[PDB]
Symmetry: T
Subunit: 148 residues, 12 copies
């Protein structure tokens, strides 16, 4: 099935882009974060970035194992992707809100992959589900700090 | 609130770190992304060894990007390596899709050679100004020099 | 055991039993390929085969223990496994390209049984279906690692 | 930054995974009771197997509960609540290893009924929470076999 | 089983049984606080609460096995634990300060039972008394790690 | 180019080849017993069989690699292994005592090939002899751990 | 003050001999045990032996650190010690009863040490108490098997 | 002598000796801050200080042993260390913000000495200079980890 | 602190504070002996002193934390530790016999403070006494490991 | 037994029994020397004696389990071991030179039984011979590490 | 040091000394090959050579320590090794097929010495013979991993 | 792309590869043949000097190759370029130490020339020589402190 492979690339490719973007912009947030929660938030952002890289890898290799290429060069990723992470120094609350905003957009792509792969490829569906479990948990670890 | 003591403060020294280490952060972080690209898309008779070597190049580039970034931040200056900025400052020969292992190694040596030029500029440019930052540039150059050899040794014949 | 509706257990045994057989066969024919492989890619491929064999052993265990957990026996004695299974791995020394092609061929027939399990367990037992999806994920990846070597 | 992102999915998780948390967390406490009080010819093997069923159950409780909380709804698993929502066949004092296994298997059978119900209820609603129920069911099914296999003769 | 100064066994049961119920309740109620905690200190307190629960589970096991090893049973079923124990941990989401104050409250009540075990075992069984001491040193330290956060 | 006794290697391959078939069959038939074992000693015997299987796989690997190191191929495909090998392990569920007797029976047959290799290799290749001696030391030990269970 | 060191030697020396003897006699039971429970009991006896060796060390090193020699040559140890462990093959139930009987006699010496050291050296009494905790738990793990 | 160059050795003692004292005093005063710290960031700051202390101990060792390797003694007795150093760390309980400022002040004093060492050793002994540069990289990072909390 | 006994906190501070000063001083002076030791046993004694310093550091921590857990602060600033403590460890290079003698001397003065804590906490707080017993067991053993070298 | 042979098992017991006794005795006598050793090489000899003890315990276990795997009991009760064995290790404190000489003397007596086993098993059971050779190889190395200290 | 029989020690030196010289040279020449290897298989062969080197270093050590344990010296100074040993490893960069051919030639020469040691120790000292047997197993296996690459 | 930089670096680091790789071999020699009252400690410390020396050899040789130049470190070249004071047979630990310290002293001469001469050529290769020199100076001290007596 050329269509099973076509459908994974269509649904999983946005996932590789946003997860690979989260690695880079996540490291930006980790470097520049300031303020009274520094060390916890600096470490937490490092763990989200490690997760993001593992997820980009799982999704990318699921596409490639099906026999289709992935274009995830820097130029392409920057084209398909954007970020609320500030350019410079920012308070820990602001870094959190910026990363949650990047995570929310990745969640919309994970859910679209989950619904889109239901009637086509349960194995590729399972990859988006496993990623969404981890990203939902990261989103909570981050956002619970602002709950009040 | 600016790192390094003895004299005050010094805005000069921080400003040189940012100037020479910033292109390093951007090229090393680009090499993480483009190296993963090469890692996913590589094909042909040397697949598993080159697939694995590229992962280890990426893991090094990521460490180097962090050490350079944190050295800039420790001196009290921000760093801009958002995806958008990094894309503007950086370019790759890694192909868009599948490619034979020889071609991937050439594309990645080309991107490493661009980083080397910026490391050698940092080493020269920091020599008169901040030996501690210079050491960061030196340490990353040794690792990058070795990764380059591991890549290039495959093409000797 | 139990009033634990007997048709769920029977569907796992029917769809996962071929996975146990072909995965356990892959352990043995993979060791064969690992011992007897030759040529310019020897070390990497000898290593990669050992890793496919380790995966195949784990997948066989996982599928078999799912059947037995649901209360049914499994026959994968050597004699049953040999009746139910066949291999393209050569008898003796062979070049790495040839070993890879033979292993990918065995992997391709296991993938057939994995997808039949996935499709067949969908309206019956989602827990057992997840065992097959998990194995299929790993097998698809092992197949790409092997097959990428022949890509030109 | 909303915190609960889909109230509907959140509610479905709370509805179907809350009994899973209660029974797994109760299984930690009553599994320990069986581990402490077990006697007879199979002591050391069963004492150790019960410890591993307890460690699983603690992880399953944690995974289930954090799935509900991540989605934005709280969980009440205080001791008083857990005790009102749960019961156990584990004996109050010393018991032979066969009776401990029967009692622990009866507790796991009631959790499998709640896991299957979660699997069924999450199917049209949230496949990501369904996957959490499916992962737990696989491990609990395995533990049930390990225990029950001792009684097969 | 087989000895057995019923006396020393009785003292252990009298004094360590409340320690088992309170430590085992702290595992359950500490997990409740770990799940539901919110606020600017979330990650550190979520993690510290896990570490308290891990300690409390080891202390319950040590105190319970000390009683059983001496030859008396322990009734630590959920229904009995719920009858013997009470918690201030809230039913839902709560700010990290409130979770700390609730958990320090539950720890303060265990400390009263730990001190009564240490005094009560003193003339009776120094080996059971050492169990109560070892537990109290860890609980005292956990109480400080929690309470230090509120010192201002 | 350059030396060696192809005679030595051929004689040695013929002594070790039976070892490889029986060891590799014991992996498959041991897993079979591991999955299907039942009764009052389940968890201990299930675990011990897993360790018997891991040793057998190491032994098959050590013997096969010895043969290949000497320059000779080895045919351990499933089809060949089934022709040369048989098992007393039952087709389905079996009481632990019977699983131990069946596995000991398979071990006993392997020990006949091992002893023949140790005796015959004494005059052929002391290096290959040492492989058989090491495999036999472990197998003699697994047999006692299994069998000591029926001593009463 | 010689009196502290003399009390330690006096009370801890029997503990060294009996723990050291339990290493040897427990190895004897570990090698020769037979029966339905072989593997569990074979492994449990190894674990008793490892504890016994650790305890004999800790007690001996306490005596020596206080300045006094210890004589636990084989010959001394055997004049001072006896065993119920059978000379050959024995069912697992009989090995357990013989090892528990050797443990019971070590318990009598441990309790005498705890009582004897109470008014004299609390630091050496802590050694006896820590060993008794461990031995009481080993005793239960053995005997629980015959509870029936 | 025990030399080498008398001059080179002397330069290293001269420039690295202050570095040994300030690092070794930071162990001691960092532990102080670690024990006595309070307030809403307690756990994270309590852990952070322990890691600064573990680094300062390592830096003290590295610098001292560089001096001794070159054949010169080092006097880092408590009494000497106390004459040659001073601390802003409070005597008792303090809020985490104040411990951070006290520690960063002790660190800025040490950075002054590290920089004079890097400047003074440039012409004389580049091996010892590298010791000071390695330490200064670590200490600069430790300073940032602390001071970042007050940027607020 | 707590809702109860001021005498418990005060006795712990009274008896364990000297122990913190002496153990923390032994970290500093032990490192001095470690760096400056010479002669035929260099490497064995260099290593042993590092292990003595690691223990002293852990003991200093355990005793300080016990005090703070009970609600009282501790002043182990360098300045204070210097006022309350002395050393026989020499200023520069010394033979290993004289480093062992100096370290033993510092350890004997610690043991006097530990035995005074043991005796003084006996009627006040058995949990705090247990801390002092545990440190004394370890320090007594370090003392023997060192002094046994001079039994020559 | 197997379908195999009783005069093999009898040989093993005959040649390996005195090994089990002497190695197990070296455990106890080795501990005795490790406790009581004094003088300028204390820590290095203390630690060396512990490693010899650890090897001796493993060697006893390997010899004993070989005998038992063959189907024969082993009597290594304290009383039997004490009967079959003697030591030159002193009752009390002794200089490290004397402890080395006493231990090497116990080792030489074991080497005599190890050599008789190697010669005696040569025509009877090459598998048990291999156990004797493996033990002798370790014992020969331990002896060298001890004796090298007295060479001058 | 010492030993029993001067003849045993003398045969060990005579037959194992050449093994020590060849293994030790293969560490040095193996490293040369590992530094200078080029071509399509660089990383696999670079890593494979490093593991051949690590094995050779261990075999050198084992053989040399066996000689010394029996009481005789070994002269393995660089000048001696160089007089006793030669290599076909090239001086400079070389393709991986050519590094493999050179290393395999150096191993072939060591295998001649090993087989001479095994034959020559057979009537003299089964313990030292077992050392040459174990080395020869490992080296025959390294030889295969190298040469398999050239089968095509 | 300056070939003279790499060649100059190779020329400074090559004697370091030879002397370090010889110390591996002659250190093993001392580690096997050492006797006397401090046997176990010195036998062990010599094994750690050897493990360091092998690392230093590797790091220096691989910097040369990374620069694109071959290194000739065959046994025959190493023996032509190197000498040792380690005795041929059994020797007391004090004599093994003096011989090894003498080999180290000759290596420090080469490390110091590399450090001085790489200062104007290649700071990255200089840094390799400084790192090896820091480790070797520590091993020198660990050995020699036993004779300070
Ligand atoms: Fe569906
Ligand atoms: Fe337990
Ligand atoms: Fe023979
Ligand atoms: Fe008292
Ligand atoms: Fe032989
Ligand atoms: Fe300069």
């Amino acid at each position: 099935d050329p269509e099973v492979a076509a459908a994974a690339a269509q649904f999983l490719t946005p996932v590789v882009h946003k997860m690979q973007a989260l690695v880079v912009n996540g490291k930006q947030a980790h470097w520049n974060v300031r303020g009274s929660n520094f060390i916890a938030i600096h470490e937490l952002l490092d763990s989200v970035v490690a997760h993001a890289q593992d997820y980009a890898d799982t999704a990318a290799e699921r596409i490639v194992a099906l026999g289709l290429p992935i274009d995830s060069r820097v130029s392409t990723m920057a084209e398909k992707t954007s970020t609320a992470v500030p350019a410079g120094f920012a308070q820990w609350q602001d870094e959190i809100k910026a990363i949650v905003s990047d995570i929310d957009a990745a969640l919309v792509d994970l859910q679209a992959a989950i619904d889109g792969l239901d009637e086509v490829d349960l194995t590729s569906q399972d990859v988006a589900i496993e990623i969404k479990r981890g990203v939902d948990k990261d989103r909570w670890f981050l956002l619970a700090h602002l709950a009040e």
